[PDB]
Design a binder for this molecule. Sequence first.
Ligand SMILES: *[C@@H]1O[C@H](CO)[C@@H](O[C@@H]2O[C@H](CO)[C@@H](O)[C@H](O)[C@H]2NC(C)=O)[C@H](O)[C@H]1NC(C)=O
Ligand SMILES: *[C@@H]1O[C@H](CO)[C@@H](O)[C@H](O)[C@H]1NC(C)=O
Ligand SMILES: *[C@@H]1O[C@H](CO)[C@@H](O)[C@H](O)[C@H]1NC(C)=O
Ligand SMILES: *[C@@H]1O[C@H](CO)[C@@H](O)[C@H](O)[C@H]1NC(C)=O
Ligand SMILES: *[C@@H]1O[C@H](CO)[C@@H](O)[C@H](O)[C@H]1NC(C)=O
Ligand SMILES: *[C@@H]1O[C@H](CO)[C@@H](O)[C@H](O)[C@H]1NC(C)=O
Ligand SMILES: *[C@@H]1O[C@H](CO)[C@@H](O)[C@H](O)[C@H]1NC(C)=O
Ligand SMILES: [Zn+2]
Lengths: 198, 596
Amino acid sequence: ITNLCPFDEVFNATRFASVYAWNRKRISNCVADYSVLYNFAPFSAFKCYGVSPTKLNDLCFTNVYADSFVIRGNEVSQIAPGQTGNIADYNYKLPDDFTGCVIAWNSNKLDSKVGGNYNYLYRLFRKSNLKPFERDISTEIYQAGNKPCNGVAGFNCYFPLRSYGFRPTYGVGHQPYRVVVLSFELLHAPATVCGPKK
Amino acid sequence: STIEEQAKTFLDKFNHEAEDLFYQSSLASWNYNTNITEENVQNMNNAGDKWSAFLKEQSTLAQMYPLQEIQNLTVKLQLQALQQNGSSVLSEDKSKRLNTILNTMSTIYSTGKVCNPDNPQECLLLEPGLNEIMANSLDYNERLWAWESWRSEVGKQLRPLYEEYVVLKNEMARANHYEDYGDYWRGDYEVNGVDGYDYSRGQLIEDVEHTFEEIKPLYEHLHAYVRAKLMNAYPSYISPIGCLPAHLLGDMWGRFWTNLYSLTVPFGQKPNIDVTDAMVDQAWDAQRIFKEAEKFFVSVGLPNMTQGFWENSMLTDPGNVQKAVCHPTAWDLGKGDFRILMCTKVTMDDFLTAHHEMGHIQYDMAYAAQPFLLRNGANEGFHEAVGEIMSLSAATPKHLKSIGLLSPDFQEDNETEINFLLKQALTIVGTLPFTYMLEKWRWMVFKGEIPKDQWMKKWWEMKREIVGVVEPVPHDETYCDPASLFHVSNDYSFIRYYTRTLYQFQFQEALCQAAKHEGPLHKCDISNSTEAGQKLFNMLRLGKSEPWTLALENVVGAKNMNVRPLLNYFEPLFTWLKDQNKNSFVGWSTDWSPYA
Ligand SMILES: *[C@@H]1O[C@H](CO)[C@@H](O[C@@H]2O[C@H](CO)[C@@H](O)[C@H](O)[C@H]2NC(C)=O)[C@H](O)[C@H]1NC(C)=O
Ligand SMILES: *[C@@H]1O[C@H](CO)[C@@H](O)[C@H](O)[C@H]1NC(C)=O
Ligand SMILES: *[C@@H]1O[C@H](CO)[C@@H](O)[C@H](O)[C@H]1NC(C)=O
Ligand SMILES: *[C@@H]1O[C@H](CO)[C@@H](O)[C@H](O)[C@H]1NC(C)=O
Ligand SMILES: *[C@@H]1O[C@H](CO)[C@@H](O)[C@H](O)[C@H]1NC(C)=O
Ligand SMILES: *[C@@H]1O[C@H](CO)[C@@H](O)[C@H](O)[C@H]1NC(C)=O
Ligand SMILES: *[C@@H]1O[C@H](CO)[C@@H](O)[C@H](O)[C@H]1NC(C)=O
Ligand SMILES: [Zn+2]
């Protein structure tokens, strides 16, 4: 039992990353207790796109990835294979062959402020859609127009990143939502992460 | 590479920025209105100034997209809404002059007082203190004094102000590619780009009149009955053959004949349905009233209220150490923030107003999914009509009998529906001629058939004919009678109320046909009818994304403003008035005047 995974750190972290700079944690070699995935009892959406959660703590994989970020309430449905929108296209893209889980819970009490919590960003403008499981943290003026922007944000030259201004009085569709998506990489290697030895 | 996609990207940026700043401004305004203090005023002004500056910057940025090559109705409509120049098209001197003229008129109307030469310490403002004289007094001479003094001290002093206002606003409209400021106001209904649903700015003029020639019989019979009920109150002062004197209407300008109910009540012995005593005996509070309102809205099929609405809204007066505005309002702060501001008491009127305001909020929730610029009613008359049909269906005896306020033993004798319809007609159909005539006069003044030499001469000439109201004193050109009203000297269109009144009954009759109603229209309750709720929601969720003709067709089934539902609503009252008007002249002769 003294090989517990760092899930209790990724779910309970006091600082989640922005969706455009989502944080990836590599769970490498330790006992994967998938039954402790109830840190926040009212999970808004705990949806597994692969093995069922009942059978989750039984399979053995070679690597686990935990991609953690914070998005809007109505933008949670975009964390799914084959979705469109700002998050899926320019911020975080999940492949249609995704094997893993998506765990999103409301965090209005944590990631909101009375004056507006302008600490979470998202990429509003991008030249082309993101490929699955690849990131883009560059802050370069998006040339919507045709005249060269010359690196100056003006007419037809937009800064690509816009801030989620989170406030506690928002509706549940505009309130902060912390999302951790677990991707279970099973590869041609010995399966390090295993289920509890119960 | 094309303007249509650069415009889309610009709108994508503008939607988010505008939503953020608008939410900040609305939150500041709400914090002021519920917590009247000193620093809240500065917060509200700063937020409003920031919002206005951002709106002006985005408006001047949106001019670079010609809108001619944008073959997408949604983007074109959003840019057209965002591209309006407004007062920023004239010279700075002329714009400053117009702003000063508007502010002076607004302040002098707000600070309007009455001077009594008999006693200098008898100053009264338009605040209800003067309103009891024009709404409850039974003295011809006192009412005449109040009317004449108000038209002499405020009306006479707003003549050159309005005279220069007309010229400045006409210049603004002509610089804004409109033949008139009246054309500017009529542009709130213009629809172009979509085939079959096109509707012209001038097409309003021939429609509002076309739906008014069918109002003349019912309003004429109502006027005849009201007149017949005023010779007994005012002997030898009404002249049955003649018109109604202007200062005896139960209101300062005769907008609503609501206060005439106590004088022209059909059956005095029978009373009105007043469940105030029942709902104060059953230990009801504001929270219970709003819970019943959302129960009604869920029963009809619409979604219930947001969880944040119950904790953020102010439903009961906090007046222990605080101040607020008593006006019941519905607030759409943006980003899923919906609130209701009213000092609700245990009263039937508060029940109906809660239903009306929560209908406003339900409409806001319905079109909350649309982009920021398209988050409004399909035209200026849909918010108020949608809110009003809720109170229309809430006040029926079969709804109060269901919720328990009216005990399930009430007998609806046919003498009581006559009282109810007459009370409601003194407010609903008693304002249509006044609204139509005032808006027509103001349109004619703006466009130019009425010269400044004949501003008064036409105003009463219309008032003696369209609405059948005769002045008691021969006002000269010095006076400005149609400037004393609140809406006229405040940059507010007034045909909105006419269109709202017609849309109210159109929507009500449509949702009754969807609810399998059987009897008369005035006994309709659309509760527990998911069909009516779905039919209404189809139009509610559209917002401005579709032409108002299409939205009206989404519920009514006809893409034009029709008056027949209104006449169907008052049909029993119309029959009773026709029977009751025997042995009494129906109509009026303009060739009479009390002063002569
Ligand atoms: C709409 O339906 C409701 C129930 O579905 C009815 O209102 C009352 O509901 C209480 C619930 O305990 C019951 O006494 C009856 O079902 C109803 N009472 C009466 C006197 O009708 C009613 O059918 C509808 N409510 C309205 C129209 O307000
Ligand atoms: C999880 O975080 C909370 C703070 O929200 C704190 O009690 C502690 O860091 C964690 N709780 C545990 C490990 O029980
Ligand atoms: C809001 O009202 C309360 C009184 O209950 C008081 O704190 C003050 O008047 C207002 N708040 C602020 C921050 O001004
Ligand atoms: C117009 O643009 C909007 C937003 O991009 C799009 O949803 C709509 O489909 C477009 N109109 C047509 C006819 O495709
Ligand atoms: C607003 O002003 C601009 C400035 O040239 C003008 O081109 C345009 O026609 C005006 N009217 C609009 C945008 O409706
Ligand atoms: C509203 O209805 C929903 C069901 O869709 C549910 O949250 C609950 O019954 C109601 N919530 C509130 C706050 O009224
Ligand atoms: C309907 O009302 C009339 C008077 O308005 C009355 O004479 C008649 O008896 C009523 N019908 C009834 C009570 O059935
Ligand atoms: Zn209102």
